C-alpha cells in the first residue's frame, strides 16, 4: 500500500511540474516541453530537484533534512 501511494504521489508531483513548465516556458525559442535528458526511454527515479524544484523552501527543507535533523 505504501508503494502504491508513493508511486501515485511521485507521478502527480511530476505531472504538476510538467503542467507548470508548459506555462512558464511558452515563449522560449526552442524549448521542447517535457524533454528527457537521458537517451534511454526507461523510467528514471526523480532527483528531488525535479520534484520540489518549483516549491517553497519549507517543503524542500523537510524533504531534504527532516529525517536527519529529527531528534
Ligand X SMILES: CCCCCCCC/C=C\CCCCCCCC(=O)O[C@H](COC(=O)CCCCCCC/C=C/CCCCCCCC)COP(=O)(O)OCCN
CA distances from 50 to 7, 23, 36, 37 (A): 15, 17, 12, 12
- Cα separation, 29 vs 66, whole angstroms: 39
Binding flag, residue 41, another protein (CB under 8 A) = no
Q: Which does 22 bind (CB under 5 to 8 A by kind): ligand X, another protein, none?
A: none
Residues 5-34 contacting another protein, CB under 8 A: 5-6, 8-10, 12, 16, 20-21, 23-25, 28, 31
Q: Where are the alpha helices (DSSP H) in 1-71?
A: 2-24, 57-69
Binding site for another protein (CB under 8 A): 2, 5-6, 8-10, 12, 16, 20-21, 23-25, 28, 31, 37-40, 42, 44-51, 53-71
Amino acid at each position: 500500500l505504501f508503494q502504491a501511494e508513493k508511486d501515485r504521489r511521485v507521478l502527480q508531483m511530476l505531472r504538476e511540474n510538467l503542467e507548470e513548465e508548459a506555462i512558464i516556458m511558452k515563449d522560449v525559442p526552442d524549448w521542447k516541453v517535457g524533454e528527457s535528458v537521458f537517451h534511454t526511454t526507461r523510467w528514471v527515479t526523480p532527483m528531488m530537484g525535479e520534484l520540489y524544484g518549483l516549491r517553497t523552501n519549507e517543503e524542500i527543507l523537510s524533504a531534504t533534512y527532516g529525517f536527519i535533523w529529527y531528534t
